[PDB]
With several copies, the nearest count.
Chain A
Amino acid sequence: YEHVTVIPNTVGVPYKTLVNRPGYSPMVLEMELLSVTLEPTLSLDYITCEYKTVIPSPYVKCCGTAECKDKSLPDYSCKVFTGVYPFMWGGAYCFCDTENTQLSEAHVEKSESCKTEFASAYRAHTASASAKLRVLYQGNNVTVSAYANGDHAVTVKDAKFIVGPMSSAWTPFDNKIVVYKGDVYNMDYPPFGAGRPGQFGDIQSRTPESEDVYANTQLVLQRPSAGTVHVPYSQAPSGFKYWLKERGASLQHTAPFGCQIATNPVRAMNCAVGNMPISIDIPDAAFTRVVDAPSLTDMSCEVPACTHSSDFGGVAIIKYAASKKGKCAVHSMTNAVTIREAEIEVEGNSQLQISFSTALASAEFRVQVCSTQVHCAAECHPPKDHIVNYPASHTTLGVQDISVTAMSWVQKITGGVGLVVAVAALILIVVLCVSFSR
């Protein structure tokens, strides 16, 4: 027998569904999403990390001009300063005061830390969902874990559950993403080879092991001073070291839909978006013939209490007579009322209680308790508590539609004005008739 249904994507709220097969005793599944995971597909554009600037000991030419020399290194510059007259601790390093030169050279390179402290910049272009689901079937709680891409049917207690694909393509991740040590950010980072000084991506590297460094630190060598031997320079500080301070908040803290984030691999989790189709194949031998089950008759329903809380604030008590000892599936025929139970024991000529939850201000619903249906109605009161630590366990209200008994004022005023209109239209049609016939 093939059953198909749609559960909202909300994690941690259990949903009932009814497997009504005519001629057999109905059975009720409860299933609850424990966790939905969206894992995107990542293409690495580059690493970014703290550079070091490499400055050899300077060449000083005593009595002559050094020649500037050109070579390919990631952000290389070289310059010759003239008239520099350096002192070491024991005396002048050159003979003579003037016509000396100093040659200075520098280039930038990845630090030893780039094996350990790197942002990684990626494109993240499509996603492959998974779900962990608890299902209550023939009175056993059982937990099952599955891919939710619409394939991967998972067996459990000989039924087969197949889940997804999810009804929306939404993800927190933009087309471009960067990740640090377990935190991930949406940002439109600069393309490879387009990086600018003092910003994210001032140094770039195609992989964490490539020698193809690009860098644009705007390094400038400056003239030495006061007969000192050193090399002074100006460059923009590491745009990575700045980004670690400037970041803002990781997507774990800012994503919509109550979403959570993780890394190794990167995932979005628990997004309260859309809904998930699910299908059950239940083997023909799992059903009990309607004559071999319990059956219930002469039943009636009473509602002692009804608070429209988030958390089973109503209780209904059902009188019944029953033909044999056994479990019965219990289900609501009205989407606005959720029942906590799923199967209850039935015996004798007696009564049972169900706890239920609703947003209705005047509950009316039909309960089905093993094939027999009973109409059940109550007057509700609001909770006193304002705030709670759990989501609403019931389906949300049909706004501008449902309302209450004691909204009878809508009938008692529309069935006032509608008569004032009808008498006005009558008198107009009467005098239209007398204008011809009299």
Chain B
Amino acid sequence: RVPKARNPTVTYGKNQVIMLLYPDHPTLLSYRNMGEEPNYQEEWVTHKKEIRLTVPTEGLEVTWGNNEPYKYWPQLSTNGTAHGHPHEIILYYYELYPTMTVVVVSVASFVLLSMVGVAVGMCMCARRRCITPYELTPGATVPFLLSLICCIRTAK
């Protein structure tokens, strides 16, 4: 016959279990991810202690002394919201898709502020092909109407 260690006092953070442990005598704590990379870790605890375990999307299994394993999974929770103003929807996708989010908002911004650069670039490539003959002529009077593509002042 072997003893079973006392129930730990547990409380939950965003992606965490916080556990307060009451060993009567040296007791093994072990835990693993339930995913592809198990990342196993353990320690003998010998006096009262607090642990904070990061709980991944795959879930965490924690086995404390001779007790049966505890199991914990995160669930999609945030202070942000979709359906709000656009800063709130971005803060919402940063809930638990932060790796997706920082990729997709950065590369989306890269193609968007690239495209306005290419649009202004095509407008300048056009403006170069346009005003060329009006520079090359010795009768160099650009028309008062056309002057607006040169951006020249006053309705004179």
Asked if A and B form a direct contact in the complex, defined as CB atoms under 8 angstroms apart, the reply is: yes
**A315-362 residues at the B interface, CB under 8 angstroms:** 359, 361-362
* Nearest-Cβ distance from residue A401 to partner chain B, whole angstroms: 10
**A394-438 residues at the B interface, CB under 8 angstroms:** 399-400, 403-404, 406-407, 409, 413-414, 417, 420-421, 423-425, 427-428, 430-432, 434-435
Do A258 and B59 form a contact, CB below 8 Å, given A198-B9, A361-B92, A387-B74? Answer: yes
A78 within 8 A of B: no
Residue ID in chain B nearest A308 by CB atoms: B76
Do A387 and B112 form a contact, CB below 8 Å, given A404-B82, A428-B126? Answer: no
B45 within 8 A of A: no
Please tell me which stretch of A39-47, A104-112, A376-384 contacts chain B, meaning at least 4 of its Cβ atoms lie within 8 angstroms of it.
A376-384
**Which of B40, B73, B81 contacts A388, CB < 8 Å?**
B73
Do A420 and B77 form a contact, CB below 8 Å, given A218-B7, A386-B12? Answer: no
**Which of A249, A400, A421, A434 contacts B104, CB < 8 Å?**
A400
Instruction: Tell whether, in the assembled complex, residue A428 and residue B122 are in contact, meaning their CB atoms are under 8 Å apart.
Output: yes
A134 within 8 A of B: no
**Apart from A385-B12, A387-B55, A417-B116, what 19 extra A-B contacts exist at CB < 8 Å?**
A220-B7, A236-B9, A242-B48, A249-B42, A254-B38, A256-B38, A258-B61, A309-B75, A362-B82, A382-B76, A386-B12, A387-B16, A388-B73, A388-B75, A391-B59, A407-B82, A421-B119, A424-B120, A435-B129
- Residues of B in contact with A, size category: 35 or more
A198 vs B76: C-alpha distance in the bound complex, in angstroms? 31
Q: Identify the 3 closest CB pairs spanning chains A and B, nearest first.
A: A258-B34, A424-B119, A387-B12
Contacts of A428 in B (CB 8 A): 122-123, 125-126, 129
Contacts of B6 in A (CB 8 A): 234-237
Most chain B beta carbons < 10 A, residue from A249, A386, A391, A400: A386
A141 within 8 A of B: no
A/B interface sample: 27 pairs, CB < 8 A = A218-B7, A236-B6, A237-B6, A249-B42, A253-B30, A254-B38, A257-B34, A257-B36, A308-B76, A310-B73, A361-B92, A380-B82, A382-B76, A385-B75, A391-B73, A392-B73, A400-B100, A406-B83, A407-B89, A409-B86, A417-B115, A420-B119, A421-B118, A424-B119, A424-B122, A427-B123, A435-B129
A272 within 8 A of B: yes
Contacts of A420 in B (CB 8 A): 115-116, 119
Contacts of B142 in A (CB 8 A): none
Instruction: Tell whether, in the assembled complex, residue B76 and residue A417 are in contact, meaning their CB atoms are under 8 Å apart.
Output: no
Q: Digitize B119-153: 1 where CB-to-A-CB distance is under 8 Å, 0 elsewhere.
A: 11111011001100000000000000000000000
Q: Tally A residues with Cβ within 8 Å of B.
A: 61
Instruction: Tell whether, in the assembled complex, residue A253 and residue B75 are in contact, meaning their CB atoms are under 8 Å apart.
Output: no
A165 within 8 A of B: no
**Chain B interface (Cβ within 8 Å of chain A)?**
6-7, 9, 12-17, 20, 22, 30, 32, 34-38, 40, 42, 48, 55, 58-59, 61, 63, 70-78, 81-84, 86, 89, 92-93, 95, 97, 100, 103-104, 112, 115-116, 118-123, 125-126, 129-130
**A223-247 residues at the B interface, CB under 8 angstroms:** 234-237, 242
* Nearest-Cβ distance from residue B76 to partner chain A, whole angstroms: 6
A123 within 8 A of B: no
Instruction: Tell whether, in the assembled complex, residue A406 and residue B75 are in contact, meaning their CB atoms are under 8 Å apart.
Output: no
Contacts of A256 in B (CB 8 A): 35-38
Contacts of B92 in A (CB 8 A): 361, 382
**A242-269 residues at the B interface, CB under 8 angstroms:** 242, 249, 253-258
Instruction: Tell whether, in the assembled complex, residue B122 and residue A425 are in contact, meaning their CB atoms are under 8 Å apart.
Output: yes
A390 within 8 A of B: yes
Instruction: Tell whether, in the assembled complex, residue A254 and residue B36 are in contact, meaning their CB atoms are under 8 Å apart.
Output: no
Q: Digitize A197-223: 1 where CB-to-B-CB distance is under 8 Å, 0 elsewhere.
A: 111000000000000000000101000
* Nearest-Cβ distance from residue A255 to partner chain B, whole angstroms: 7
Instruction: Tell whether, in the assembled complex, residue B59 and residue A310 are in contact, meaning their CB atoms are under 8 Å apart.
Output: no
A389 within 8 A of B: yes
Contacts of B75 in A (CB 8 A): 309-310, 383, 385-388, 392
A196 within 8 A of B: yes
Instruction: Tell whether, in the assembled complex, residue A431 and residue B22 are in contact, meaning their CB atoms are under 8 Å apart.
Output: no
Contacts of A254 in B (CB 8 A): 32, 38, 40
Instruction: Tell whether, in the assembled complex, residue A253 and residue B129 are in contact, meaning their CB atoms are under 8 Å apart.
Output: no
* Nearest-Cβ distance from residue A36 to partner chain B, whole angstroms: 15
**Which of B9, B17, B72, B97 contacts A399, CB < 8 Å?**
B97
Instruction: Tell whether, in the assembled complex, residue B7 and residue A272 are in contact, meaning their CB atoms are under 8 Å apart.
Output: no
